[PDB]
Amino acid sequence: PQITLWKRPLVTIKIGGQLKEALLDTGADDTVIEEMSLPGRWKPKMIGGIGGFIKVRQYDQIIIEIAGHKAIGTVLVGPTPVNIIGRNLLTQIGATLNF
Amino acid sequence: PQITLWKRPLVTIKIGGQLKEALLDTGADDTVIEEMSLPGRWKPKMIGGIGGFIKVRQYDQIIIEIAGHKAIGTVLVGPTPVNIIGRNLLTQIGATLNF
Protein backbone atom coordinates (compact mmCIF):
# COMPACT_ATOMS: atom_id res chain seq x y z
CA PRO A 1 0.00 0.00 0.00
CA GLN A 2 0.83 3.68 0.00
CA ILE A 3 0.24 5.31 3.40
CA THR A 4 -0.12 9.05 3.61
CA LEU A 5 0.90 10.80 6.77
CA TRP A 6 -2.02 13.09 7.42
CA LYS A 7 -2.86 10.69 10.27
CA ARG A 8 -0.72 8.39 12.42
CA PRO A 9 0.33 5.35 10.35
CA LEU A 10 -1.31 2.72 12.50
CA VAL A 11 -1.69 -0.88 11.41
CA THR A 12 -2.87 -4.14 12.85
CA ILE A 13 -0.20 -6.59 13.97
CA LYS A 14 -0.25 -10.10 15.32
CA ILE A 15 2.39 -11.06 17.90
CA GLY A 16 2.40 -13.81 20.51
CA GLY A 17 -0.97 -14.95 19.12
CA GLN A 18 -2.48 -11.54 19.96
CA LEU A 19 -3.88 -8.80 17.66
CA LYS A 20 -2.70 -5.29 18.49
CA GLU A 21 -2.46 -1.87 16.93
CA ALA A 22 1.00 -0.45 16.27
CA LEU A 23 2.65 2.61 14.74
CA LEU A 24 4.90 2.22 11.68
CA ASP A 25 7.81 4.29 12.98
CA THR A 26 10.78 5.17 10.80
CA GLY A 27 12.40 7.12 13.68
CA ALA A 28 12.59 3.93 15.83
CA ASP A 29 15.65 1.72 15.36
CA ASP A 30 13.93 -1.11 17.19
CA THR A 31 10.38 -2.50 17.65
CA VAL A 32 8.96 -1.84 21.15
CA ILE A 33 5.71 -3.41 22.31
CA GLU A 34 3.69 -2.72 25.49
CA GLU A 35 4.08 -5.25 28.31
CA MET A 36 3.08 -8.76 27.32
CA SER A 37 4.51 -12.28 27.68
CA LEU A 38 6.56 -13.81 24.86
CA PRO A 39 8.09 -17.31 24.80
CA GLY A 40 11.79 -18.05 25.02
CA ARG A 41 14.72 -16.31 26.59
CA TRP A 42 15.12 -12.60 27.06
CA LYS A 43 17.74 -10.21 28.38
CA PRO A 44 17.40 -6.74 29.89
CA LYS A 45 18.06 -3.61 27.90
CA MET A 46 17.73 0.17 28.32
CA ILE A 47 16.35 2.21 25.42
CA GLY A 48 16.01 5.98 25.29
CA GLY A 49 13.80 8.41 23.51
CA ILE A 50 12.27 11.80 24.22
CA GLY A 51 11.84 11.95 28.02
CA GLY A 52 14.70 9.57 28.78
CA PHE A 53 15.11 5.83 29.11
CA ILE A 54 12.96 2.82 29.89
CA LYS A 55 14.00 -0.71 30.80
CA VAL A 56 12.77 -3.36 28.43
CA ARG A 57 13.06 -7.11 27.89
CA GLN A 58 14.80 -8.06 24.63
CA TYR A 59 13.36 -11.16 22.93
CA ASP A 60 15.12 -12.38 19.80
CA GLN A 61 13.71 -14.29 16.81
CA ILE A 62 10.07 -13.33 17.32
CA ILE A 63 7.63 -13.59 14.42
CA ILE A 64 5.26 -10.72 13.91
CA GLU A 65 2.59 -10.28 11.21
CA ILE A 66 2.49 -6.57 10.17
CA ALA A 67 -0.45 -5.52 8.09
CA GLY A 68 -0.56 -9.08 6.74
CA HIS A 69 3.18 -9.43 6.05
CA LYS A 70 5.23 -11.81 8.16
CA ALA A 71 8.59 -10.72 9.55
CA ILE A 72 10.98 -12.10 12.19
CA GLY A 73 13.27 -10.16 14.43
CA THR A 74 14.07 -8.76 17.88
CA VAL A 75 11.17 -7.32 19.85
CA LEU A 76 11.65 -5.17 22.91
CA VAL A 77 8.87 -5.43 25.52
CA GLY A 78 8.36 -2.76 28.17
CA PRO A 79 6.43 0.33 29.36
CA THR A 80 6.25 2.18 26.03
CA PRO A 81 3.15 4.39 25.78
CA VAL A 82 2.45 3.01 22.26
CA ASN A 83 3.33 -0.11 20.29
CA ILE A 84 6.05 0.80 17.76
CA ILE A 85 7.21 -1.13 14.68
CA GLY A 86 10.73 0.11 14.08
CA ARG A 87 13.20 -0.19 11.29
CA ASN A 88 14.44 -3.69 12.21
CA LEU A 89 11.05 -5.02 11.11
CA LEU A 90 10.02 -2.33 8.60
CA THR A 91 12.93 -3.37 6.40
CA GLN A 92 11.69 -6.93 6.30
CA ILE A 93 8.30 -5.97 4.84
CA GLY A 94 10.01 -3.80 2.22
CA ALA A 95 8.88 -0.46 3.65
CA THR A 96 10.26 2.74 2.18
CA LEU A 97 9.77 6.46 2.56
CA ASN A 98 9.05 8.24 -0.71
CA PHE A 99 8.86 11.89 -1.65
CA PRO B 1 13.74 9.87 -3.47
CA GLN B 2 12.96 6.41 -2.27
CA ILE B 3 14.56 5.81 1.16
CA THR B 4 15.04 2.32 2.51
CA LEU B 5 15.28 1.75 6.26
CA TRP B 6 18.38 -0.39 6.74
CA LYS B 7 20.02 2.81 8.07
CA ARG B 8 18.48 5.74 9.98
CA PRO B 9 16.62 8.01 7.53
CA LEU B 10 18.81 11.02 8.20
CA VAL B 11 18.62 14.06 5.91
CA THR B 12 20.04 17.53 5.87
CA ILE B 13 17.79 20.34 6.95
CA LYS B 14 18.35 24.07 6.85
CA ILE B 15 16.79 26.29 9.49
CA GLY B 16 17.82 29.81 10.55
CA GLY B 17 20.52 29.57 7.89
CA GLN B 18 22.15 26.63 9.63
CA LEU B 19 22.54 23.12 8.22
CA LYS B 20 21.63 20.31 10.58
CA GLU B 21 20.95 16.59 10.36
CA ALA B 22 17.49 15.31 11.21
CA LEU B 23 15.60 12.03 11.24
CA LEU B 24 12.52 11.55 9.01
CA ASP B 25 10.15 10.18 11.66
CA THR B 26 6.74 8.79 10.79
CA GLY B 27 6.18 8.02 14.46
CA ALA B 28 6.40 11.69 15.43
CA ASP B 29 3.31 13.88 15.12
CA ASP B 30 5.49 16.98 15.54
CA THR B 31 8.91 18.28 14.43
CA VAL B 32 11.29 18.63 17.37
CA ILE B 33 14.76 20.24 17.13
CA GLU B 34 17.65 20.58 19.60
CA GLU B 35 18.12 23.92 21.39
CA MET B 36 18.69 26.79 18.98
CA SER B 37 17.48 30.34 18.49
CA LEU B 38 14.42 31.04 16.35
CA PRO B 39 12.72 34.31 15.55
CA GLY B 40 9.38 35.47 16.89
CA ARG B 41 7.29 34.45 19.86
CA TRP B 42 6.87 30.94 21.21
CA LYS B 43 4.09 29.13 23.07
CA PRO B 44 4.38 26.31 25.58
CA LYS B 45 3.87 22.66 24.74
CA MET B 46 4.49 19.39 26.55
CA ILE B 47 5.27 16.38 24.40
CA GLY B 48 5.49 12.77 25.46
CA GLY B 49 7.73 10.06 24.13
CA ILE B 50 9.13 6.74 25.15
CA GLY B 51 10.66 7.85 28.40
CA GLY B 52 8.15 10.45 29.54
CA PHE B 53 7.34 14.12 28.89
CA ILE B 54 9.49 17.12 28.10
CA LYS B 55 8.66 20.83 27.90
CA VAL B 56 9.41 22.46 24.52
CA ARG B 57 9.10 25.89 22.92
CA GLN B 58 6.56 25.98 20.08
CA TYR B 59 7.46 28.31 17.18
CA ASP B 60 4.86 28.61 14.44
CA GLN B 61 5.31 29.46 10.74
CA ILE B 62 9.08 28.80 10.60
CA ILE B 63 10.81 28.34 7.27
CA ILE B 64 12.74 25.09 7.04
CA GLU B 65 14.33 23.24 4.15
CA ILE B 66 14.18 19.42 4.38
CA ALA B 67 16.22 17.30 1.99
CA GLY B 68 15.87 20.12 -0.49
CA HIS B 69 12.11 20.65 -0.09
CA LYS B 70 10.62 23.88 1.25
CA ALA B 71 8.36 23.69 4.31
CA ILE B 72 6.93 26.44 6.50
CA GLY B 73 5.36 25.30 9.75
CA THR B 74 5.57 24.56 13.40
CA VAL B 75 8.89 23.65 14.99
CA LEU B 76 9.26 22.56 18.59
CA VAL B 77 12.57 23.36 20.30
CA GLY B 78 13.76 21.52 23.39
CA PRO B 79 15.95 18.83 24.86
CA THR B 80 15.30 16.19 22.25
CA PRO B 81 18.17 13.69 21.83
CA VAL B 82 18.03 14.03 18.02
CA ASN B 83 16.46 16.39 15.56
CA ILE B 84 13.18 14.85 14.33
CA ILE B 85 11.03 15.76 11.30
CA GLY B 86 7.49 14.73 12.18
CA ARG B 87 4.33 14.28 10.18
CA ASN B 88 3.43 18.00 10.31
CA LEU B 89 6.32 18.68 7.88
CA LEU B 90 6.58 15.23 6.24
CA THR B 91 3.15 15.98 4.75
CA GLN B 92 4.46 19.31 3.45
CA ILE B 93 7.24 17.61 1.49
CA GLY B 94 4.83 14.99 0.12
CA ALA B 95 6.25 11.98 2.00
CA THR B 96 4.46 8.64 2.05
CA LEU B 97 5.25 5.20 3.46
CA ASN B 98 5.10 2.39 0.91
CA PHE B 99 5.36 -1.39 1.01
Ligand SMILES: CN[C@H]1CO[C@@H]2OC[C@H](OC(=O)N[C@@H](Cc3ccccc3)[C@H](O)CN(CC(C)C)S(=O)(=O)c3ccc(OC)cc3)[C@@H]21
Ligand atom coordinates in the same frame (compact mmCIF):
# COMPACT_ATOMS: atom_id res chain seq x y z
C1 LIG C 1 2.89 10.74 22.15
N1 LIG C 1 3.48 11.93 21.51
C2 LIG C 1 4.63 11.60 20.64
C3 LIG C 1 4.12 11.29 19.22
O1 LIG C 1 3.97 12.52 18.54
C4 LIG C 1 4.75 13.54 19.20
O2 LIG C 1 5.80 13.93 18.31
C5 LIG C 1 7.06 13.85 18.99
C6 LIG C 1 6.87 12.65 19.95
O3 LIG C 1 6.99 11.46 19.16
C7 LIG C 1 7.84 10.49 19.59
O4 LIG C 1 8.58 10.56 20.57
N2 LIG C 1 7.81 9.40 18.82
C8 LIG C 1 8.54 8.15 18.96
C9 LIG C 1 7.49 7.03 18.95
C10 LIG C 1 6.51 7.25 20.11
C11 LIG C 1 5.19 7.61 19.88
C12 LIG C 1 4.30 7.87 20.93
C13 LIG C 1 4.73 7.72 22.24
C14 LIG C 1 6.07 7.37 22.49
C15 LIG C 1 6.95 7.13 21.43
C16 LIG C 1 9.58 7.99 17.85
O5 LIG C 1 8.93 7.78 16.59
C17 LIG C 1 10.57 6.86 18.13
N3 LIG C 1 11.44 7.22 19.24
C18 LIG C 1 12.79 7.60 18.87
C19 LIG C 1 12.94 9.04 18.37
C20 LIG C 1 12.54 10.07 19.43
C21 LIG C 1 14.40 9.32 17.95
S1 LIG C 1 11.33 6.22 20.55
O6 LIG C 1 9.91 5.77 20.66
O7 LIG C 1 11.77 7.04 21.72
C22 LIG C 1 12.37 4.83 20.35
C23 LIG C 1 13.69 4.83 20.80
C24 LIG C 1 14.51 3.72 20.63
C25 LIG C 1 14.04 2.57 20.00
O8 LIG C 1 14.77 1.44 19.80
C26 LIG C 1 16.09 1.42 20.34
C27 LIG C 1 12.72 2.56 19.55
C28 LIG C 1 11.90 3.67 19.72
C29 LIG C 1 5.43 12.90 20.39
Ligand SMILES: [Cl-]
Ligand atom coordinates in the same frame (compact mmCIF):
# COMPACT_ATOMS: atom_id res chain seq x y z
CL1 LIG D 1 0.46 -11.34 27.61
Ligand SMILES: [Cl-]
Ligand atom coordinates in the same frame (compact mmCIF):
# COMPACT_ATOMS: atom_id res chain seq x y z
CL1 LIG E 1 16.16 -7.70 14.45
Ligand SMILES: [Cl-]
Ligand atom coordinates in the same frame (compact mmCIF):
# COMPACT_ATOMS: atom_id res chain seq x y z
CL1 LIG F 1 15.48 -3.34 0.24
Ligand code: NA
Ligand atom coordinates in the same frame (compact mmCIF):
# COMPACT_ATOMS: atom_id res chain seq x y z
NA1 NA G 1 13.97 -15.97 21.30
Ligand code: NA
Ligand atom coordinates in the same frame (compact mmCIF):
# COMPACT_ATOMS: atom_id res chain seq x y z
NA1 NA H 1 6.20 32.43 14.62
